Amino acid sequence: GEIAKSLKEIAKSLKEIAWSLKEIAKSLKG
Amino acid sequence: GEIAKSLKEIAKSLKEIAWSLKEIAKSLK
Amino acid sequence: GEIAKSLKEIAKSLKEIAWSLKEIAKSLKG
Amino acid sequence: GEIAKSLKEIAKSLKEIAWSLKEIAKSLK
Amino acid sequence: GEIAKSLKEIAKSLKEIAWSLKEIAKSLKG
Amino acid sequence: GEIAKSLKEIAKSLKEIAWSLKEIAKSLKG
Ligand SMILES: CC(C)=CCC/C(C)=C/CC/C(C)=C/CO
Numbered sequence: 001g002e003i004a005k006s007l008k009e010i011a012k013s014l015k016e017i018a019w020s021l022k023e024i025a026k027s028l029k030g
Numbered sequence: 031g032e033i034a035k036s037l038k039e040i041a042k043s044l045k046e047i048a049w050s051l052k053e054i055a056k057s058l059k
Numbered sequence: 060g061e062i063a064k065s066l067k068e069i070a071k072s073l074k075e076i077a078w079s080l081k082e083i084a085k086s087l088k089g
Numbered sequence: 090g091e092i093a094k095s096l097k098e099i100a101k102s103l104k105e106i107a108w109s110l111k112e113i114a115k116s117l118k
Numbered sequence: 119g120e121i122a123k124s125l126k127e128i129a130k131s132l133k134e135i136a137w138s139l140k141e142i143a144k145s146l147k148g
Numbered sequence: 149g150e151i152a153k154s155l156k157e158i159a160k161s162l163k164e165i166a167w168s169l170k171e172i173a174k175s176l177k178g
Pocket residue numbers: 040047069073076128158
């Protein structure tokens with residue numbers, strides 16, 4: 001349903017955010 | 031419903047946040 | 060209910076966070 | 090219930106995160 | 119339940135995230 | 149169900165995010 005759909009959206013965005021933050025963390029080493 | 035509306039609202043900001051962090055990740059390379 | 064109330068709070072905070080990250084992204088371009 | 094309790098904690102933490110990100114934005118100006 | 123269990127994990131993670139961002143904010147002052 | 153699955157994904161992502169932010173905080177000290 002709508003809630004599930006949004007949660008999948010939220011889950012996809014958090015995966016992207018995690019990836020970007022991993023990238024940032026790697027850059028600041030360095 | 032309200033939860034659903036809030037969840038759509040929640041999903042949009044996280045897209046903005048994801049984009050900004052992509053930009054930030056790009057600047058820092 | 061409490062859950063809805065909390066979700067509206069959560070939504071508001073995420074808007075503040077998104078805004079701050081836009082600012083941060085801008086500063087780091089220079 | 091437990092879900093409601095957790096969401097309140099989540100809201101509280103997001104307020105803290107928001108405050109910190111404002112401080113971070115100020116520093117980078 | 120499974121949902122409640124996940125929310126506690128999420129709540130725990132957000133506390134850690136808040137803590138880390140506070141440390142980051144402090145470091146960026148000087 | 150799907151909601152629980154998404155929340156597990158969300159919980160997993162926030163753990164990653166928390167971890168990356170610790171790395172970033174450590175780096176800014178340093
Ligand atoms: C509202 C529920 C079910 C999950 C929301 C999780 C969430 C709002 C995480 C935000 C993490 C964040 C924006 C970090 C920014 O550095």
